Amino acid sequence: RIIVVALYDYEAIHHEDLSFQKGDQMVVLEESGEWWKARSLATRKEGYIPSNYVARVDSLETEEWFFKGISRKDAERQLLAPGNMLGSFMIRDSETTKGSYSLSVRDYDPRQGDTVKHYKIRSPRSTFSTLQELVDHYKKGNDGLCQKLSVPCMSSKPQKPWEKDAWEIPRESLKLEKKLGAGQFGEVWMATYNKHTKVAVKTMKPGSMSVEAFLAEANVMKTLQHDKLVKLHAVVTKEPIYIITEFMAKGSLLDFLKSDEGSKQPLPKLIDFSAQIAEGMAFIEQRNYIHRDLRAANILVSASLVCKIADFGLARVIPIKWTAPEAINFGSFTIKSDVWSFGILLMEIVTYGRIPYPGMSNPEVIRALERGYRMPRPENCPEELYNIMMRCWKNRPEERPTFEYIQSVLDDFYTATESQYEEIP
Numbered sequence: 001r002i003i004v005v006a007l008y009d010y011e012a013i014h015h016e017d018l019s020f021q022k023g024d025q026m027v028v029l030e031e032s033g034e035w036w037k038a039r040s041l042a043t044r045k046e047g048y049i050p051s052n053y054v055a056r057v058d059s060l061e062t063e064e065w066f067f068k069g070i071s072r073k074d075a076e077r078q079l080l081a082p083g084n085m086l087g088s089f090m091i092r093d094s095e096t097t098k099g100s101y102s103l104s105v106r107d108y109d110p111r112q113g114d115t116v117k118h119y120k121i122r123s124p125r126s127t128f129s130t131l132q133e134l135v136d137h138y139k140k141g142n143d144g145l146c147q148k149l150s151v152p153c154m155s156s157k158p159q160k161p162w163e164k165d166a167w168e169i170p171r172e173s174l175k176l177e178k179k180l181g182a183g184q185f186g187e188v189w190m191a192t193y194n195k196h197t198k199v200a201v202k203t204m205k206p207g208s209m210s211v212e213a214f215l216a217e218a219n220v221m222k223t224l225q226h227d228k229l230v231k232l233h234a235v236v237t238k239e240p241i242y243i244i245t246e247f248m249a250k251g252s253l254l255d256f257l258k259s260d261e262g263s264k265q266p267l268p269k270l271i272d273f274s275a276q277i278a279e280g281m282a283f284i285e286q287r288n289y290i291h292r293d294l295r296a297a298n299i300l301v302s303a304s305l306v307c308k309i310a311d312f313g314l315a316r317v318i319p320i321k322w323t324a325p326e327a328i329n330f331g332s333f334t335i336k337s338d339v340w341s342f343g344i345l346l347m348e349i350v351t352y353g354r355i356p357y358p359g360m361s362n363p364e365v366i367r368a369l370e371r372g373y374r375m376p377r378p379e380n381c382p383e384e385l386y387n388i389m390m391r392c393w394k395n396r397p398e399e400r401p402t403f404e405y406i407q408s409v410l411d412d413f414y415t416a417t418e419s420q421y422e423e424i425p
């Protein structure tokens with residue numbers, strides 16, 4: 001008889017799902033993925049609950065200061081997001097000591113700025129019974145920490161999982177309310193699914209993109225979910241093909257960088273964007289795929305300033321200034337040619353969306369590349385960041401770095417390796 005408890009309030013929006021409040025417990029009846037059949041103990045109603053909204057009772061996730069499955073850098077990102085302050089903290093699974101837990105605390109530093117310090121856990125000069133007591137002490141005066149614990153890190157509701165068994169949907173479920181962009185193969189619309197969920201919808205123009213073959217690839221992309229790739233929610237099988245993805249409130253990185261909220265983003269933020277994108281490419285790199293069209297226009301920014309690679313699968317169904325010479329001349333697109341593109345993307349970001357090689361036509365650009373030309377360095381781009389672009393722009397593909405390496409460098413750009421975790425007496 002399994003029992004769970006609710007971490008956040010939830011309003012039912014479908015037919016068979018339950019409403020529940022933060023703290024309500026319920027008996028688990030069926031475990032079938034993102035949705036669980038359960039029986040609320042507060043209402044006695046049976047129905048479906050989003051499985052990521054609940055945790056086993058008396059387990060660590062029930063605590064407001066615990067954060068399951070969070071990397072050191074994610075913890076750094078979450079702690080630095082608005083709503084937090086000096087002393088804000090969390091306890092999470094250690095990324096390196098795979099089985100133990102670490103502490104992450106927010107600090108201010110007059111030179112650097114707002115920072116996040118990480119402390120490993122099991123100082124020998126302190127024995128607390130379990131993790132709760134540990135928290136309890138450091139809240140009243142630091143026992144060595146660079147700052148003393150104030151409040152747990154702000155946490156917001158997870159994204160609602162898509163409706164169960166609603167991968168193939170009828171067109172009737174959608175109201176496409178606003179055309180966001182048009183192009184060669186169709187349009188992208190801001191839409192509403194069953195009057196309750198805001199989504200984005202890619203409407204396809206039919207071509208050699210064979211129906212039952214286009215849908216084959218979309219099914220592939222649906223297996224390749226990652227936090228840094230845009231969620232594939234649903235599909236409409238009948239021509240013209242509709243692709244339903246999650247809505248990204250701030251649109252393209254290109255447009256967002258050109259905006260006024262964009263022109264306020266400091267360099268550490270721009271690099272953070274780059275790090276997110278490289279994490280997405282690193283996932284793709286690991287799975288042995290290729291994006292083939294990496295650039296700022298194909299990156300989406302969420303409302304919370306999270307950057308995701310806008311899929312990516314469009315090359316499995318169908319701009320040389322972003323393209324490596326090897327793929328331009330012989331059509332040899334690889335993960336290494338994306339690296340080149342990423343380097344160009346990197347320049348876009350630092351230049352707030354300024355078009356690459358400004359003032360040069362395509363052939364101008366190509367012959368310049370063969371000469372050995374590369375874009376110069378903007379009067380705000382760091383030498384060490386520029387050096388990364390150059391390494392991406394190596395003429396021989398095999399000498400360009402991996403995304404795995406690129407991600408690790410951008411992630412800790414301002415942090416010496418020796419300074420990742422603090423070390424206490």
Ligand SMILES: Nc1ncnc2c1c(-c1ccc(NC(=O)Nc3ccccc3)cc1)cn2C1CCCC1
Pocket residue numbers: 180181188200201202217218221230232243245246247248249251252300310311312313314317
């Ligand atoms: N999701 C969004 N949310 C908010 N705004 C969005 C978008 C998108 C958007 C961009 C790319 C896609 N691509 C996509 O779904 N590709 C795909 C997925 C599976 C199989 C084949 C292709 C979908 C929506 C585009 N846009 C705006 C429209 C033009 C600029 C940004």
Ligand SMILES: [Ca+2]
Pocket residue numbers: 418419420421422423
């Ligand atoms: Ca140290």
Ligand SMILES: [Cl-]
Pocket residue numbers: 027039
């Ligand atoms: Cl019961």
